[PDB]
Design a protein around this ligand. Structure first.
Ligand SMILES: *[C@@H]1O[C@H](CO)[C@@H](O[C@@H]2O[C@H](CO)[C@@H](O[C@@H]3O[C@H](CO[C@@H]4O[C@H](CO)[C@@H](O[C@H]5O[C@H](CO)[C@@H](O)[C@H](O)[C@@H]5O)[C@H](O)[C@@H]4O)[C@@H](O)[C@H](O[C@H]4O[C@H](CO)[C@@H](O)[C@H](O)[C@@H]4O)[C@@H]3O)[C@H](O)[C@H]2NC(C)=O)[C@H](O)[C@H]1NC(C)=O
Ligand SMILES: *[C@@H]1O[C@H](CO)[C@@H](O[C@@H]2O[C@H](CO)[C@@H](O[C@@H]3O[C@H](CO)[C@@H](O)[C@H](O)[C@@H]3O)[C@H](O)[C@H]2NC(C)=O)[C@H](O)[C@H]1NC(C)=O
Ligand SMILES: *[C@@H]1O[C@H](CO)[C@@H](O[C@@H]2O[C@H](CO)[C@@H](O[C@@H]3O[C@H](CO)[C@@H](O)[C@H](O)[C@@H]3O)[C@H](O)[C@H]2NC(C)=O)[C@H](O)[C@H]1NC(C)=O
Ligand SMILES: *[C@@H]1O[C@H](CO)[C@@H](O[C@@H]2O[C@H](CO)[C@@H](O)[C@H](O)[C@H]2NC(C)=O)[C@H](O)[C@H]1NC(C)=O
Ligand SMILES: *[C@@H]1O[C@H](CO)[C@@H](O[C@@H]2O[C@H](CO)[C@@H](O)[C@H](O)[C@H]2NC(C)=O)[C@H](O)[C@H]1NC(C)=O
Ligand SMILES: *[C@@H]1O[C@H](CO)[C@@H](O[C@@H]2O[C@H](CO)[C@@H](O)[C@H](O)[C@H]2NC(C)=O)[C@H](O)[C@H]1NC(C)=O
Ligand SMILES: *[C@@H]1O[C@H](CO)[C@@H](O[C@@H]2O[C@H](CO)[C@@H](O)[C@H](O)[C@H]2NC(C)=O)[C@H](O)[C@H]1NC(C)=O
Ligand SMILES: *[C@@H]1O[C@H](CO)[C@@H](O)[C@H](O)[C@H]1NC(C)=O
Ligand SMILES: *[C@@H]1O[C@H](CO)[C@@H](O)[C@H](O)[C@H]1NC(C)=O
Ligand SMILES: [Ca+2]
Ligand SMILES: [Ca+2]
Ligand SMILES: [Ca+2]
Ligand SMILES: [Ca+2]
Ligand SMILES: [Ca+2]
Ligand SMILES: [Ca+2]
Ligand SMILES: [Ca+2]
Lengths: 66, 737, 465
């Protein structure tokens, strides 16, 4: 029921372990300063002839575009 | 320079079998016979259901040049289940890498494919077969359970293999961990003992392997080439590996500790896509017991004469020092698109001088792109940048380039003559060629002459036939030859003595032998190896003191010795060779005694003067004109002294005045050579000091152009001396009336 | 006074005209016998010869069509119809101006990386192709465009050779569908159909292989050396646009796949539009690639993604004459490189003469951009669209033929327009048309009388027979 796994994460309020106002994420490769990364941003360089894993712009984790 | 190229031992394999792709020597420790280990990765074997699996053939050198395959594996593809082939030996390229220790033979199949133990796949893990004479085991380090592209599934083990001094096998697979590459080292005894056909993922104890790295190291191809040498304090062999695609395709060479596979030192290329690390060699080239690293970059492009990049190839020579320092130099290729740094093969001490040598091959060089091999001799300061011998391919391309020099092996004495041999494989024409090093004979030739200053007056020498008692001088020449390896005790030399060298251009010859009476004398020698200076005495006599042209040019004595080459080791005639960096001739200088002061050179002072005695001639007549010339040398001896009277287009010479005793009867001549007519008169050879000449020359003048107003002569004395050989030019004028 | 006219042209009027350009003839009977009939026009006037009886035709140039050189049918050579009247043994000079106003012919071949790593760049490369076609259509009016594709060498370990369902569908292991792997595929020949190019570009889809490096240099070499297949035009500027998003396989990489045969630079694209030597020949080296590009006069352009921009910039440093651009959602960088490459095109005006009469001779003075007259030169270099060059051509004819009319075409090499002439050789006098057949007027003799003078036949060597 907590948006941040680590209780010490500043992106989430310590009182209710929920996201503080103005913040949308607390962890992830597509998460920057408690905010989602811009859509289309490369976040996972793959191995071999594979397409890059991008940022959806609405989540904090890279989708499996493998 | 001592490799025998006229009659090399040529071996041939099946057509299209890539025979000669890998070459090696087989020197069993229990037999006196040696064999050539030639790999044919595309040869057709007798394995049931296997097409072009490849094979390794041992070739007898003693006679018949026969090559017979070694049966490392006679069974076909194993089955994981009823209908489930466990392995795929077709086109496995077995024989692409052959290595041999005393009794062990290591042959590998880099393109050998395996169906893993989890899912039906075809992964080129690569496999090797280690044969210890009687027991043949299978070594597949990359056939482990870490099987994928990110594991060892595409390792292609056995792409490069090597043997360490401590009975260890260094194996390189450039496909491991998404083509990062891997080095795997195992003890031979462990490989033999731990073998079991039922288990395919055999785990060997005391195995040294490089682990996976970060994803930015992918496609580096570590293990493309391998080498072994010692690069730290202990005696264990460290692992030199070429990484030709590392550092953003710049190329790198990794040196790993041979004890725990720890990184030791790094080399990096200077140009991209040059394949720095295609071939690596480790040998001591300056003979100080520190192994040096030779790295080939066959695709290197250097700046040409016009500033354009040309692909010539390059080899980097790094000399190991007492500390971890390396002294790196570069060896650029000689022909464009020849791939100079393709193969580097240590030759050992090919000429038994004291420093190991190395062979570098450009397999696409030479005429018709046949292939070329360069031999470089090591020196105390490193490697000689100028190759001493050139080996050329002699087979034209059939469908693919002959690739003569794509693989070479050396440093093994196959004929027991004391010098290492060299096998060159041209897999394009399916050929393996063995080059035998010839014995090198070092000759210390001397030429001693009795005192170089010869006195023409000193004539205390008798003569045959006439006994004219003319001067003579002696010549003594000594010959000793020594060499290493198999060589008969007595060597036949023929020596020729030629007098008046550097002066024999169809002119006269002054120094003649007392008995032969000829300037050229030839004598045959039968000298022994390691013997004393065999010296012989000859007598040469000079000509008459007033016979030859001059006494200023020194007499040069030329001796030319050459080795009689019917000196065979009763093995198809392997003739010896003379050392390349030795003087094949020796020349001494003899001078003629001439009183020329303390400086040993005659420096004359030449003066010329003339009076008119007529001071006027009339135009219309042929007027007899006599010029009184005084030629004096107040300096030292003037050799070949003559005065030059360059008369104009008007007059001509009549004769010397002989009706009076106050003047001389000089021998005079009319010359017209080289656009100018002039009168010469001999003044004495030599023209002694303080000698004052006075003579007259009669002429006849008839004017050319009606407005001339004068007749001008020019007088000058010249000699063949080297300094102050000419008098000041004096111009005498006679006025027309 | 006595001159070459008085010594060579005294025979009759046509020979006098043939002697020298400044020789003049008198056809007045008032002139007493003894005074020269062929001399200077000023000399004839001094010799009270009738001006109407003086036949002195001066060689001159009569321009007929002189519509000015067009600016940006277009008029590219002025004048375009010049009439030449040349008396025998005379030289006349005329001036022409050549201006390059037609747009440059450009051939663009587009190489697409159709590997699986390009699944997120397929839209970018297709948009780049369409924008390339549009930009050169708006830049030059003589554009020929085409494209091809590559993945890598179709052999292990690059290909997915297992399971058997992975041969026709390399994405079988990941439970998706992709095109089978190929080495190089020539899809569209160089054509002027931009709509066809756009349709074929948009129809493309990606394939799959195993390792990150790709066989794009094989495709580059094949497109460079297969002139007939690609459609390169000899008299045009060739641009090869190479698109990729990863590292590239280079020479000696094929030893892992079992390929040890070096690339020989020959063409191996058959009727199936496929690189047939992909699985047997190694990847090309940078030296061979540069040599082939220089030989075929092809301007390589790297349109690569940001992650490989530095790598391909260093590659282009190793390959002189190559530019690198960033492939992205917008094609501004590659389009700017294309614009610069088009602007670096320089044209040469090589003068050629066709069916020139043997008796006629030509001399050429070139007034290039240096504004320095260089005699003996007829082909200036450099030049741009709109830029003009001028030539001074002097025509000399040895004697005169019996054709009485000759015409030759002066054309600049590679130019649609041309300049024609009408060389009307005088070779005779106007009074000769009113000649008298024989005898009659020429006294009692039976010679022939024309142009106020008589010239008898054989035997009669008198002035008037
Ligand atoms: C000759 O050239 C060779 C090639 O350049 C040199 O070899 C390279 O040496 C590097 C050190 O000098 C070495 O970097 C070290 O790599 C190890 C690998 O362990 C890792 O373990 C991680 C967990 O399993 C995984 O990667 C983690 O870290 C990376 C960032 O590096 C992250 O991106 C990953 O997501 C993951 O979190 C891997 O599985 C990998 O196996 C590292 O442990 C080392 O870390 C040390 O340094 C960092 C600071 O950079 C410290 O914070 C840390 O605490 C450690 O002290 C190093 O990064 C290269 O791997 C290696 N590459 C190759 C191909 O050999 C060689 O050294 C040179 N020799 C000479 C004599 O010049
Ligand atoms: C080793 O033995 C195999 C026998 O399986 C040889 O492979 C065979 O090579 C011939 C060429 O001489 C192939 O014939 C080819 O047939 C195709 C039509 O299928 C035709 O287009 C070609 O022009 C050619 O005639 C034959 O198919 C092939 N058999 C296979 C691959 O199973 C191989 O050449 C031998 N290699 C050596 C080094 O001896
Ligand atoms: C005039 O010419 C004669 C040549 O017939 C000179 O006689 C030779 O002179 C050499 C040295 O100039 C001497 O040879 C010596 O032989 C002894 C052994 O007896 C050896 O130990 C010495 O090292 C040296 O080689 C010797 O006097 C004589 N040799 C022969 C073979 O005739 C003579 O010296 C000349 N005199 C002058 C004034 O130039
Ligand atoms: C692998 O072997 C090397 C050399 O045999 C070891 O390197 C030495 O390590 C000790 C202790 O860490 C140091 O005191 C020495 O200075 C090192 N010698 C060098 C770097 O030349 C290394 O520790 C061994 N183990 C590994 C690499 O895990
Ligand atoms: C004498 O020996 C010298 C070497 O000690 C050689 O003379 C050279 O011959 C090579 C090969 O033709 C030439 O490239 C050199 O220019 C020569 N140098 C000199 C000093 O002549 C040769 O072996 C012998 N030459 C003669 C004339 O006997
Ligand atoms: C392309 O070439 C440039 C120039 O050599 C490389 O930039 C160098 O990168 C190294 C990284 O080890 C630095 O140490 C140098 O200082 C850099 N020099 C300059 C002038 O920038 C660049 O890394 C190369 N990139 C690729 C992908 O090969
Ligand atoms: C090319 O230019 C040269 C130089 O202007 C011309 O040569 C001149 O010809 C005129 C007329 O005969 C002379 O008066 C000048 O003295 C010449 N100058 C020189 C330096 O030669 C030449 O006629 C021109 N040719 C053409 C075809 O235009
Ligand atoms: C020396 O050898 C040559 C050639 O081998 C021979 O002609 C000559 O007779 C020999 N001289 C003597 C003295 O044997
Ligand atoms: C021919 O050259 C002369 C110079 O000798 C020049 O005056 C004249 O204009 C030229 N002819 C033409 C048609 O320009
Ligand atoms: Ca060691
Ligand atoms: Ca050393
Ligand atoms: Ca040596
Ligand atoms: Ca030997
Ligand atoms: Ca002196
Ligand atoms: Ca991509
Ligand atoms: Ca690939």
């Amino acid at each position: 029921e907590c948006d941040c796994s680590s209780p010490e994460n500043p992106c989430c309020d310590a009182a209710t372990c929920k996201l503080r106002p103005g913040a949308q994420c607390g962890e992830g490769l597509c998460c920057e300063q408690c905010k989602f990364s811009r859509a289309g941003k490369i976040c996972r360089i793959p191995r071999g002839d594979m397409p890059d894993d991008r940022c959806t712009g609405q989540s904090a984790d890279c989708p499996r575009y493998h | 320079f001592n490799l025998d190229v006229d009659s090399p031992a040529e071996y041939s394999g099946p057509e299209g079998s890539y025979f000669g792709f890998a070459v090696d020597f087989f020197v069993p420790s229990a037999s006196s016979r040696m064999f050539l280990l030639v790999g044919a990765p595309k040869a057709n074997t007798t394995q049931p259901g296997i097409v072009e699996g490849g094979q390794v053939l041992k070739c007898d050198w003693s006679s018949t040049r026969r090559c017979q395959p070694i049966e490392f594996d006679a069974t076909g593809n194993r089955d994981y289940a009823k209908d489930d082939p466990l392995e795929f030996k077709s086109h496995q390229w077995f024989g692409a890498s052959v290595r041999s220790k005393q009794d062990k033979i290591l042959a590998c199949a880099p393109l050998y494919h395996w169906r893993t133990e989890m899912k039906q796949e075809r992964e080129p893990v690569g496999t090797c077969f280690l044969q210890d004479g009687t027991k043949t085991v299978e070594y597949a380090p990359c056939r482990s359970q870490d099987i994928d592209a990110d594991g060892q599934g595409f390792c292609q083990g056995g792409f490069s293999i090597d043997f360490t001094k401590a009975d260890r096998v260094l194996l390189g697979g450039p496909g491991s961990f998404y083509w990062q590459g891997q080095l795997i080292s195992d003890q031979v005894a462990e490989i033999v003992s731990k073998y079991d056909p039922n288990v395919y993922s055999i785990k060997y104890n005391n195995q040294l392997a490089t682990r996976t790295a970060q994803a930015i190291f992918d496609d580096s191809y570590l293990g493309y080439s391998v080498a072994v040498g010692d690069f730290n304090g202990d005696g264990i062999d460290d692992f030199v590996s070429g990484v030709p695609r590392a550092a953003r395709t710049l190329g790198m060479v990794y040196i790993y500790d041979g004890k725990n596979m720890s990184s030791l030192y790094n080399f990096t290329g200077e140009q991209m896509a040059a394949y720095f690390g295609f071939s690596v060699a480790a040998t001591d080239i300056n003979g100080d017991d520190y192994a040096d690293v030779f790295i080939g970059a066959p695709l290197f492009m250097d700046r040409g004469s016009d500033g354009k990049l040309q692909e010539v190839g390059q080899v980097s020579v790094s000399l190991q020092r007492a500390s971890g320092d390396f002294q790196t130099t570069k060896l650029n290729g000689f022909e464009v698109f020849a791939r100079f740094g393709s193969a580097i093969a240590p030759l050992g001490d090919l000429d038994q001088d004291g420093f190991n040598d190395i062979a570098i091959a450009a397999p696409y060089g030479g005429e018709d792109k046949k292939g070329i091999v360069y031999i470089f001799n090591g020196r105390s300061t490193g490697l000689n940048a100028v190759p001493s011998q050139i080996l050329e391919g002699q087979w034209a391309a059939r469908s693919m380039p002959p690739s003569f020099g794509y693989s070479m092996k050396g440093a093994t004495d196959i004929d027991k003559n004391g010098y290492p041999d060299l096998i060159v494989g041209a897999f394009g024409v399916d050929r393996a060629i063995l080059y035998r090093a010839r014995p090198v004979i070092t000759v210390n030739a001397g030429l001693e002459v009795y005192p170089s200053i010869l006195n023409q007056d000193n004539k205390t020498c008798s003569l045959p036939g006439t006994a004219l008692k003319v001067s003579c001088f002696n010549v003594r020449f000594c010959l000793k030859a020594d060499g290493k390896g198999v060589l008969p005790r007595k060597l036949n030399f023929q020596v020729e003595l030629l007098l008046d060298k550097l002066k024999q251009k169809g002119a006269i010859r002054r120094a003649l032998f007392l008995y032969s009476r000829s300037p050229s004398h030839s004598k045959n020698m039968t000298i022994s190896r390691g013997g004393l200076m065999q010296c012989e005495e000859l007598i040469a006599y000079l000509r008459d003191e007033s016979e030859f042209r001059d006494k200023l040019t020194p007499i040069t004595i030329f001796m030319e010795y050459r080795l009689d080459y019917r000196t065979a080791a009763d093995t198809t005639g392997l003739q010896p060779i003379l050392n390349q960096f030795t003087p094949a001739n020796i020349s001494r200088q003899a001078h003629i005694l001439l009183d020329c002061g303390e400086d040993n050179v005659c420096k004359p002072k030449l003066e010329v003067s003339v009076d008119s005695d007529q001071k006027k001639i009339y135009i219309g007549d042929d007027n007899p004109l006599t010029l009184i010339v005084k030629a004096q040398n107040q300096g030292e001896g003037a050799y070949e002294a003559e005065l030059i009277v360059s008369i104009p287009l008007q007059a001509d010479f009549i004769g010397v005045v002989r009706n009076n005793e106050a003047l001389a009867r000089l021998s005079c001549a009319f010359k017209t050579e080289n656009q100018t007519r002039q009168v010469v008169c001999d003044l004495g050879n030599p023209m002694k000091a303080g000698t004052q000449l006075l003579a007259g020359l009669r002429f006849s003048v008839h004017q050319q152009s009606e407005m001339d107003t004068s007749v001008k002569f020019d007088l000058q004395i010249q000699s063949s001396n080297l300094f102050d050989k000419v008098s000041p030019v004096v111009s005498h004028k006679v006025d027309l009336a | 006074g006595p001159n070459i006219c008085t010594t060579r042209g005294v025979s009759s009027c046509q020979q006098c005209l043939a002697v020298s350009p400044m020789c003049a003839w008198c056809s007045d009977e008032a002139l007493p016998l003894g005074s020269p009939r062929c001399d200077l026009k000023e000399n004839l006037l001094k010799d009270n010869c009738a001006p109407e009886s003086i036949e002195f035709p001066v060689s001159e140039a009569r321009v007929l069509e002189d519509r000015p050189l067009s600016d940006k049918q277009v008029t590219q050579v002025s004048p375009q119809r010049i009439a030449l009247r040349l008396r025998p043994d005379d030289s006349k000079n005329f001036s022409i101006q050549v201006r390059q106003v037609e747009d440059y012919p450009v051939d663009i071949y587009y190489l697409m990386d159709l590997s699986y790593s390009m699944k997120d760049d397929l839209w970018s490369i297709q948009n780049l192709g369409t924008k390339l076609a549009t930009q050169m259509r708006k830049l030059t009016s003589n554009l020929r465009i085409g494209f091809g594709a590559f993945v890598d060498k179709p052999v292990s370990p690059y290909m997915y050779i297992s399971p058997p369902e992975a041969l026709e569908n390399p994405c079988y292991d990941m439970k998706t569908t992709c095109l089978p792997m190929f080495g190089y595929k020539h899809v569209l020949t160089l054509t002027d159909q931009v709509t066809r190019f756009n349709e074929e570009v948009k129809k493309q889809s990606v394939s799959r292989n195993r390792d990150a490096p790709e066989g794009g240099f094989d495709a580059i070499m094949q497109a460079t050396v297969c002139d007939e297949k690609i459609g390169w035009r000899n008299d045009a500027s060739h641009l090869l646009v190479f698109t990729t998003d990863a590292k590239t396989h280079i020479a000696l990489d094929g030893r892992l796949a079992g390929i040890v045969q070096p690339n020989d630079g020959q063409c191996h694209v058959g009727s199936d539009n496929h690189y047939s030597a992909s699985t047997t020949m190694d990847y090309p080296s940078l030296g061979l690639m540069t040599e082939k590009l220089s030989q075929k006069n092809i301007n390589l352009i790297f349109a690569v993604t940001e992650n490989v921009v530095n790598l391909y910039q260093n590659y282009s440093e190793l390959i002189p004459g190559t530019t690198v651009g960033v492939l992205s959602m917008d094609s501004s960088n590659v389009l700017q490189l294309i614009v610069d490459a088009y602007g670096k095109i320089r044209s040469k005006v090589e003068l050629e003469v066709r069916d020139l009469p043997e008796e006629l001779s030509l001399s050429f003075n070139a007034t290039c951009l240096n504004n320095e007259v260089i005699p003996g030169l007829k082909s200036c270099m450099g030049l741009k669209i709109g830029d003009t060059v001028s030539f001074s051509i002097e025509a000399k004819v040895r004697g005169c033929p019996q054709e009485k009319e000759k015409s030759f075409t002066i054309k600049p090499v590679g130019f649609k327009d041309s300049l024609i002439v009408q060389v009307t050789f005088d070779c005779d006098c106007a009074c000769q048309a009113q000649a008298e057949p024989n005898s009659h007027r020429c006294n009692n003799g039976n010679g022939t009388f024309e142009c106020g003078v008589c010239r008898c036949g054989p035997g009669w060597l008198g002035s008037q027979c």
